[PDB]
Enzyme design. Structure first.
Site, PDB file in Angstrom:
ATOM      1  N   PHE A   1       0.802  -1.236   0.000  1.00  7.74           N
ATOM      2  CA  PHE A   1       0.000   0.000   0.000  1.00  7.74           C
ATOM      3  C   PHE A   1       0.831   1.281   0.000  1.00  7.74           C
ATOM      4  O   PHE A   1       0.275   2.377   0.102  1.00  7.74           O
ATOM      5  CB  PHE A   1      -0.947   0.031   1.204  1.00  7.74           C
ATOM      6  CG  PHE A   1      -1.798  -1.195   1.339  1.00  7.74           C
ATOM      7  CD1 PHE A   1      -1.809  -1.920   2.527  1.00  7.74           C
ATOM      8  CD2 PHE A   1      -2.582  -1.635   0.270  1.00  7.74           C
ATOM      9  CE1 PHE A   1      -2.596  -3.059   2.653  1.00  7.74           C
ATOM     10  CE2 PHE A   1      -3.372  -2.775   0.382  1.00  7.74           C
ATOM     11  CZ  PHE A   1      -3.381  -3.491   1.573  1.00  7.74           C
ATOM     12  N   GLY A   2       2.151   1.147  -0.099  1.00  6.70           N
ATOM     13  CA  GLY A   2       3.039   2.304  -0.130  1.00  6.70           C
ATOM     14  C   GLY A   2       4.496   1.904  -0.029  1.00  6.70           C
ATOM     15  O   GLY A   2       4.839   0.733  -0.202  1.00  6.70           O
TER      16      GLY A   2
ATOM     17  N   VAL B   1       8.682   2.365   1.800  1.00  7.03           N
ATOM     18  CA  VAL B   1       9.433   2.390   3.048  1.00  7.03           C
ATOM     19  C   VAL B   1      10.641   3.301   2.862  1.00  7.03           C
ATOM     20  O   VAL B   1      11.377   3.164   1.893  1.00  7.03           O
ATOM     21  CB  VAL B   1       9.947   0.971   3.430  1.00  7.03           C
ATOM     22  CG1 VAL B   1      10.499   0.965   4.859  1.00  7.03           C
ATOM     23  CG2 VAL B   1       8.844  -0.086   3.263  1.00  7.03           C
TER      24      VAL B   1
ATOM     25  N   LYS C   1       7.710   3.310   7.491  1.00  8.36           N
ATOM     26  CA  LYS C   1       6.799   2.638   6.571  1.00  8.36           C
ATOM     27  C   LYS C   1       5.525   3.470   6.366  1.00  8.36           C
ATOM     28  O   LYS C   1       4.745   3.679   7.297  1.00  8.36           O
ATOM     29  CB  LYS C   1       6.460   1.212   7.035  1.00  8.36           C
ATOM     30  CG  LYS C   1       5.438   0.508   6.123  1.00  8.36           C
ATOM     31  CD  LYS C   1       5.788  -0.935   5.800  1.00  8.36           C
ATOM     32  CE  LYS C   1       5.660  -1.827   7.021  1.00  8.36           C
ATOM     33  NZ  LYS C   1       5.802  -3.269   6.662  1.00  8.36           N
TER      34      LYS C   1
ATOM     35  N   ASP D   1       3.404 -15.910   8.189  1.00  8.30           N
ATOM     36  CA  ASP D   1       3.932 -15.678   6.836  1.00  8.30           C
ATOM     37  C   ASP D   1       5.466 -15.835   6.702  1.00  8.30           C
ATOM     38  O   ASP D   1       6.124 -15.054   5.996  1.00  8.30           O
ATOM     39  CB  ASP D   1       3.493 -14.299   6.349  1.00  8.30           C
ATOM     40  CG  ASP D   1       3.454 -14.193   4.837  1.00  8.30           C
ATOM     41  OD1 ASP D   1       3.369 -15.233   4.145  1.00  8.30           O
ATOM     42  OD2 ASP D   1       3.517 -13.052   4.336  1.00  8.30           O
TER      43      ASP D   1
END
Ligand SMILES: [Mg+2]
Lengths: 339, 61, 619
Positions: free
Chosen positions: C174-175, C177, C192, C289
């Protein structure tokens, strides 16, 4: 049986009292005074405004020099003023914010005050180190200090909301004498010129005359229909006046043992906070919750004038010993000197 | 209660057992006092303004 | 202006009451805080002579706890039982108990020198520090100084302005770092950013909020092997995490460059990763994950677990849904109605370590993209461990990839410890792993919007800002604390010396029944004044004068909260129908003034109402 047989005795006694009183009531003071001149229109004006209190004023008391006075306030301070110049002699910040009353000792060396702290607190005004400090906290009351007055440097009388009054030895800090008898919050006391007797006014709507030396109620005055908020000896000590929530003041004579006169007016609906006589006794000045103080001809009951300056309750007043000046304290936070 | 109702009766007995004067005499003694001290009362009998602190007096102790 | 200015000492009037209301003025709560400890030792080492040797000894026992090997500890063991100890046992009121001594001598006399050897002393040192000494601490100005610092802590409001951004280091979901530096302190950090519009566009609002909450649960304890958070904040259009800084790229990219790793190399990555997992599991978080792309490298080649967006609190409810990446999920995860705990991660770890050695997930044969095939192999296929793998490695990988949770390594009751004591890791001292002392195998080298942000969307992020207390205190501890402490000591002594020239106004708060005092500003025309609150009134003054004005508690009909512009204020409604509006310098200060004012006027109106001379009447 016993609660009945005594309560039946209580009325027969109460009757004897009403009846003996009635036996004396052969004429009225207003009949007796009918022939003397009126005082005419008493128009006093504000000759000083005292500023410094940051909130309501509750109490004030002139010094015997007719020059300095103490004031007690919601702002947590006492202020001692030089009424001639407007200067503050002293500003005494208190330990409890809740003061309701204050007194100046006849000597000038001391002042007293207190309130919801339930402690009459004495302040020494001329120390060895030139400072203003607490010389004594008088504990013992189980209710708020409503009023207090010195006899001398080492003796003071207090009235409390616990319903008692009391006389203290300041050095030892103990109640010499307790004056029990009132059945509701005591609100004012006044000392007779000779400090032999004193009167108190309570929320039971009665005033009581006490013998200071012995410690007992000698006489009990009724008539009022509501709390007595203030009380005051007539200058020769044979009578006193009262101020009530019922919108009246009243004159009570000791030796007749009854009410002599009412001071009222259909147009005055609100309660009296304070009372004091002029030096001769002829004027009775009373402070009101309508922002004014009314000046009554004590002998004829007429209304002689009005002091209309404050913007909120007149909450306390005093006349000076030299009779030159009236002081009024108000919820507006100012005192005013009138003459 | 039964203590405190005998305390009332004893106190009432004290209050009844005073003796009293006529209201006529009482009133007269007050009226006589005011007339004796009328000239000494500055609110009735004004004093000269130069001797009144709140009017025109200049010099003080 | 970019550095920290502490508020004046008078803030203590308001901060002590704030902390007291939360029972945070205790030896335990302050001593265990970093900045609380540094201030307490300063007090003890420098201002209370009778507490010095206790703290000195405390600090000597701590040096001892951190010593790496048994040979060193045998040395200090005796070395310690000489210098201070003879002062302590001959000092009255200071002898340690025999119970405590005997205990220590019983180990020491049998040459037994564990790190906790001197622990019984720690407990008694604490017993003697927590009474008189602590109460003297509270009275002292070093506690005034703690309040000053605490107030800064609890008033942190971050924006992009508080950070100097340096360079990009990872286009993500979504963006992006960035690598940055907090202006306050100079601390190096990762920022972030997550674009609020993109979050709305991909319906990715739960993922960002879960990342926030999970980082929060995991970022205490100062873990060397997880990318942790120190702050969380948000601008009108961004979400910002401030995280540990990792310059070195991920293990998926490095695997890509380096090719597969040997056992020796895989072992080192494995050790560090395992402790990371130990950290989460102990705080009841399941990562879900684990894969090389979520393992980052610092400049020296040490690793940390990275994207916490998909992790899960399992303390109360256990999860059950399929969540993670397809070559790496446990059988119990893939199965629809079946619940699971930490079990998931240990299987994930199996697949990931396999990948490091072989190039592919064990359940991904010959580059397949049927995620339904990969899942099926996971649920049904025995893993074909190659011949060249050592017997130790097989032991470990058979352990981790055990399809049954009740048969799987790390899922048999003792968690990480079971894995740690596997024979693959036989050679490792795990204290040394924790202290980052093994040499890393690889040192990194050198290198649309047509969418609208509505009123409702922002309401999902009102409770998004966060500051992890121990992170901030450690940041301050290790940067500017000492120099700002001395610097404000300098100011306070000068302000005291300048008030001395004036003939200092003996504090107007003493000797009376003042409840609380401090700065607030009244009313644009914001007028900063000093206020004193009394049981029956609230006064204020400007500078060089006693208060010339006030408000009584009788007038105050209510004390409510209100936003003027975007900064928050107190609205007092007042008898005559007048507003009186106060603004405070910090969140803490807003919370006490609201409370104490309310309490004072509620009490005052009760009291007056039963005093016939103070109350209002039929007018
Ligand atoms: Mg499942």
């Amino acid at each position: 049986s016993e609660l009945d047989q005594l309560r039946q005795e209580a009325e027969q006694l109460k009757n004897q009292i009403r009846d003996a009183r009635k036996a004396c009531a052969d004429a009225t003071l207003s009949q007796i005074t009918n022939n003397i001149d009126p005082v005419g229109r008493i128009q006093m004006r504000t000759r000083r405004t005292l500023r410094g209190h940051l909130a309501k004023i509750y109490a004030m008391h002139w010094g015997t020099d007719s020059r300095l006075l103490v004031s007690a306030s919601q702002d947590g301070k006492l202020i001692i003023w030089d009424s001639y110049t407007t200067n503050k002699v002293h500003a005494i910040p208190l330990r409890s914010s809740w003061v309701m009353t204050c007194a100046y000792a006849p000597s000038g060396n001391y002042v007293a005050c207190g309130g919801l702290d339930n402690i009459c607190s004495i302040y020494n005004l001329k120390t060895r180190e030139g400072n203003v400090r607490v010389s004594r906290e008088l504990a013992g009351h189980t209710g708020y200090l409503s009023c207090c007055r010195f006899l001398d440097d080492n003796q003071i009388v207090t009235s409390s909301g616990d319903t008692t009054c009391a006389l203290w030895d300041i050095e030892t800090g103990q109640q010499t004498t307790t004056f029990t008898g009132h059945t509701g919050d005591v609100m004012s006391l006044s000392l007779a010129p000779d400090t032999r007797l004193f009167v108190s006014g309570a929320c039971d709507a009665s005033a009581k005359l006490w013998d200071v030396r012995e410690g007992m109620c000698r006489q009990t005055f009724t008539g009022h229909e509501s709390d007595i908020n203030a009380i005051c000896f007539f200058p020769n000590g044979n009578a006193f006046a009262t101020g009530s929530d019922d919108a009246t003041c009243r004159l009570f004579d000791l030796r007749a043992d009854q009410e002599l006169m009412t001071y009222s007016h259909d147009n005055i609906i609100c309660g009296i906070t304070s009372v004091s006589f002029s030096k001769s006794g002829r004027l009775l000045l009373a402070g009101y919750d309508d922002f004014n103080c009314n000046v009554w001809d004590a002998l004829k009951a007429d209304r002689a004038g009005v002091l209309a300056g404050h913007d909120n309750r007149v909450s306390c007043l005093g006349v000076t010993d030299d009779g030159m000046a009236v002081a009024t304290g108000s919820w507006d936070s100012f005192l005013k000197i009138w003459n | 209660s039964i203590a405190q109702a005998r305390k009332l009766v004893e106190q009432l007995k004290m209050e009844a057992n005073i003796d009293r004067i006529k209201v006529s005499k009482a009133a007269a003694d007050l009226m006589a006092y005011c007339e004796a001290h009328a000239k000494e009362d500055p609110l009735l009998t004004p004093v000269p303004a130069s001797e009144n602190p709140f009017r025109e007096k200049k010099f003080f102790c | 202006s970019k550095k920290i200015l502490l508020p004046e000492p008078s803030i203590r009037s308001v901060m002590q009451k704030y902390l007291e209301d939360r029972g945070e003025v205790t030896f335990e709560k302050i001593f265990s805080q970093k900045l609380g400890y540094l201030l307490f030792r300063d007090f003890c080492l420098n201002h209370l002579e009778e507490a010095r040797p206790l703290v000195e000894f405390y600090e000597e026992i701590k040096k001892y706890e951190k010593l790496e090997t048994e040979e060193e500890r045998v040395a200090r063991s005796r070395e310690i039982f000489d210098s201070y100890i003879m002062k302590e046992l001959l000092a009255c009121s200071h002898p340690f108990s025999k119970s405590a001594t005997e205990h220590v001598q019983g180990h020491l006399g049998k040459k037994q020198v564990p790190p906790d050897l001197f622990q019984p002393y720690i407990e008694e040192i604490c017993q003697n520090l927590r009474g008189d000494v602590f109460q003297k601490f509270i009275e002292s100005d070093k506690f005034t100084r703690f309040c000053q610092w605490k107030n800064v802590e609890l008033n942190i409001h971050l924006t992009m302005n508080d950070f100097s951004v340096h360079r990009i280091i990872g286009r993500g979901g979504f963006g992006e770092v960035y690598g940055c530096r907090k202006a306050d302190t100079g601390k190096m950090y990762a920022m972030k950013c997550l674009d609020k519009k993109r979050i709305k566009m991909k319906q990715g609002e739960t993922l960002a909020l879960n990342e926030r909450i999970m980082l929060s649960l995991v970022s205490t304890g100062d873990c060397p092997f997880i990318v942790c958070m120190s702050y969380a904040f948000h601008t009108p259009d961004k979400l910002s995490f401030i995280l540990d800084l990792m310059n070195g790229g991920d293990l998926h990219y490095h695997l890509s460059q380096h090719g597969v790793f040997s056992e020796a190399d895989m072992r080192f990555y494995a050790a560090e990763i395992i402790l990371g997992l130990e950290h989460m599991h102990n705080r009841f978080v399941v990562y879900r994950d684990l894969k090389p792309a979520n393992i980052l490298l610092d400049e020296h080649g040490h690793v940390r677990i990275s994207d916490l967006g998909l992790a899960c609190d399992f303390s109360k409810k256990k999860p059950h849904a399929s969540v993670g990446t397809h070559g790496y999920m446990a059988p119990e995860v893939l199965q629809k109605g079946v619940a699971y705990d930490s079990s998931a991660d240990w299987f994930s770890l199996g697949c990931m370590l396999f990948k490091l050695l072989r190039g592919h997930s064990p359940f991904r044969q010959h580059k397949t993209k049927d995620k339904h095939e990969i899942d099926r192999m996971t649920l049904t296929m025995a893993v074909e461990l190659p011949d060249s793998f050592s017997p130790e490695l097989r032991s470990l990988l058979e352990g981790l990839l055990q399809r049954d949770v009740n048969r799987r390594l790390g899922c048999l009751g003792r968690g990480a410890q079971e894995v740690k004591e596997s024979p693959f890791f036989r050679s490792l001292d795990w204290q040394m792993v924790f202290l980052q002392k093994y040499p890393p195998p690889l040192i990194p080298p050198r290198g649309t919007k047509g969418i609208k942000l509505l009123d409702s969307d922002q309401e999902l992020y009102r409770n998004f800002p966060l500051t992890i207390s121990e992170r901030w205190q450690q940041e301050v501890a290790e940067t500017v604390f000492d120099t700002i402490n001395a610097e404000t000591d300098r100011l306070e002594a000068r302000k005291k010396a300048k008030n001395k020239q004036l003939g200092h106004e003996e504090d107007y708060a003493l000797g009376k029944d003042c409840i609380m005092h401090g700065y607030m500003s009244k009313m644009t025309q914001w007028q900063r004044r000093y206020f004193y609150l009394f049981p029956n009134r609230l006064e204020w003054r400007g500078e060089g004068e006693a208060p010339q004005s006030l408000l009584t508690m009788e007038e105050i009909q209510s004390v409510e909260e209100t936003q003027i512009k975007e900064r928050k204020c107190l609205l007092l409604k007042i008898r005559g129908g007048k507003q009186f509006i106060l603004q405070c310098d910090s969140d803490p200060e807003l919370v006490q003034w609201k409370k104490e004012l309310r309490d004072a006027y509620r009490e005052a109106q009760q009291l007056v109402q039963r005093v016939p001379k103070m109350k209002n009447k039929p007018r």
